[PDB]
Amino acid sequence: EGFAEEGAKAVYDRLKNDRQPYETRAESCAQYTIPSLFPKDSDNASTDYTTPWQSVGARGLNNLASKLMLALFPMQSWMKLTISEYEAKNLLGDAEGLAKVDEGLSMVERIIMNYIESNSYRVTLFECLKQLCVAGNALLYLPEPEGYTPMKLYRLNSYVVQRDAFGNVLQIVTLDKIAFNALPEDVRSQVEAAQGEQKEDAEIDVYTHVYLNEAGDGYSKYEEVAEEVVPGSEAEYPLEECPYIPVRMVRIDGESYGRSYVEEYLGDLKSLENLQESIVKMAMITAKVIGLVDPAGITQVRRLTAAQSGAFVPGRKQDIEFLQLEKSGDFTVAKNVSDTIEARLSYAFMLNSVASELEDTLGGVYSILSQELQLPLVRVLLKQLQATQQIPELPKEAVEPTISRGQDLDKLERCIAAWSALKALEGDDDLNLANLKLRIANAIGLDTAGMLLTQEQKNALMAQQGAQIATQQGAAALGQGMAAQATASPEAMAAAADSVGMQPGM
Amino acid sequence: LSQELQLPLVRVLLKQLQATQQIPELPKEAVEPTISRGQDLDKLERCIAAWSALKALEGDDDLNLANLKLRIANAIGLDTAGMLLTQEQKNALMAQQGAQIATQQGAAALGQGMAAQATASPEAMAAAADSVGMQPGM
Amino acid sequence: YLPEPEGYTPMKLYRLNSYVVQRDAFGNVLQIVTLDKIAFNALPEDVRSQVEAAQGEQKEDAEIDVYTHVYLNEAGDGYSKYEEVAEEVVPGSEAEYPLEECPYIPVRMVRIDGESYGRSYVEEYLGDLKSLENLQESIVKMAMITAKVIGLVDPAGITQVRRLTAAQSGAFVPGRKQDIEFLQLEKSGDFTVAK
Structure with missing residues (x-):
């Protein structure tokens, strides 16, 4: 137990010091965007989170989290299961053998989606994304499937992780x-x-300690409650499938934690907060009403306040003056700079002022998250569902790309349209139509495996079509033949009615 | 970056996947250009449209349609290898088309012939019902 | 660097301050x-x-520092690779790669002949970024000066500012408008020029 000689609690207390810079930086980021997201570990129920003086941080953070959720985890099939095409062709035969296998892989994907949706993972995914954007460090643990089991999210100030300079946990x-x-x-x-x-x-404080085991590659997990391990929690996980996956966005090598996205634009938020603060303070000065009456004048204000709706009272207009706030020219200068900072912060998040300029920026934000979050989650789920017989035992040769199906539908639709164009050239004896169909599919990029009709399959279609024609024509000939025979001669009409059970004449 | 990054990445993957039997052993004569498929689809679609326009001229005895199809492909730039039907390949198309007509017409005559023979005469109707296991009269 | 395929294997990216490369003026590594x-x-x-x-x-x-050295082998074309940990080679890491297929591919953009490294794309426009950085900084600095509000009242006047602050939302107090003035930042003409 080289990593666990001292104990789970001792490691947590020691490593907590390295977590301090990230916790402090997360509280600062949350203070400007959404104070409620990341309380500072001293805030109890009796703490009020005052709204930031600018609303760009809250509006941008909510928008970015939703856009990330929509792109990362769309309505259906953000992953797929693929088998090695060269290996699959050797083990199997050809034609529909690969197509049949793809049904099994596609069926596994639908089960994964159903398990994710039925357990309300999208709720935890959205909470994790908000934490990732403001704090950038989140830990999600997938418990073993047992009935309705939703995975738990650990905030930054709930767990601790130690990473190498190489980057591994x-x-x-x-x-x-x-x-x-x-x-x-x-x-x-x-x-x-x-x-x-x-x-x-x-x-009661409960610690679970997952550490890299010595020698063979894997992870060792145990739980301690007071000062000692529980009677049993020892679990072995390989690197590929570990329930505890620490996800971070904006990863810097040599660091045990990631950096939040708001931290990059925190300074612009601070300047906007200050400028927006002074602007409102000027308005409250403007709100107050003060009447400056000249002591050297003749107007007595005791007559004005005692006057009725309309009245004639002694006085002069020049005596009465109203103190109004100057700095009208200053006000415009503050708004212009405040507007400029808001405009650049709006583009930093996925906020419109453009349509073809925010997706491309968004494409780089979640590129890390596909490998950091999407891929490990699928790997853990596949093993967990295999153990509980939720999905059939995989042959271990299937690899998981996280795509955000894919080109399979587009390639089929593209070649179908191209083939339909080649339909207009049929009846031509100069051109080899069959070769052109093969050339088109290669240009599109289809596998061309089993899409062509072999000689045996051509005969099968002819036999099936021939039986349909024989039945269609045979039924018509048989139907009218019996009716013609039954109605021929009045005697046979009586016999026909006798066979069905009727009596001639009513 | 295409030469600096794209090309070396493919070269290493090609060798590494052959070693682990992920792809069939290449004959070492294959060269890969990184294109950012390609013009093959465009040439095929463009050539088809030209042939479709030439299809409006079919039935003309003055013009050599077969030569014009070859000239069109040369102008587009296709390889023109295997796109034309050889005399042996024309025979296969007629043989396959002829077999369909024989089966299509044979099935109709056979189905109508069997039904007519079974339904002729009242006693042959009973014999036909006996063959399928049925009993005359309900 | 592309490692040997073994199950799920993602290639590793080395930052500039993690590796070192030596090239000739001819450009070969x-x-x-x-x-x-x-x-x-x-x-x-x-x-x-x-x-x-x-x-x-x-x-x-x-x-533990681990160094992997890939060098052009003598005579025949190829690359020799070995790993050393403390001061000596590991029990075995000797790998030989041909020129075309080497896992360690140093990719650079904007390459200048005679140099072992490339130049970044931002360098061609760093000067404009520096110039824009200074102008944008000063513009924000002016707004913060503008953010502050100061009332300059004439000491030779008769208005007492103790009555203004102690008053309610509506009040009649002795004073004159001319006594109270507000300091506001000038250089409206500058602001447009810098903008």
């Missing part, structure tokens, strides 16, 4: 605070024999 | 060296034992 420790009654019975008794008698709703 | 810092436990056992017998006892999470 060495150990992960998370903190949970479960009440005494909510703990499992064996764990509940263990605490009773460690810290004496505990209250019914007493918070 | 002579040698490439990469530096990696892997923790002691993450290293393979054969390498891990070698470090144990080289630098003594090592901490579990101690970063």
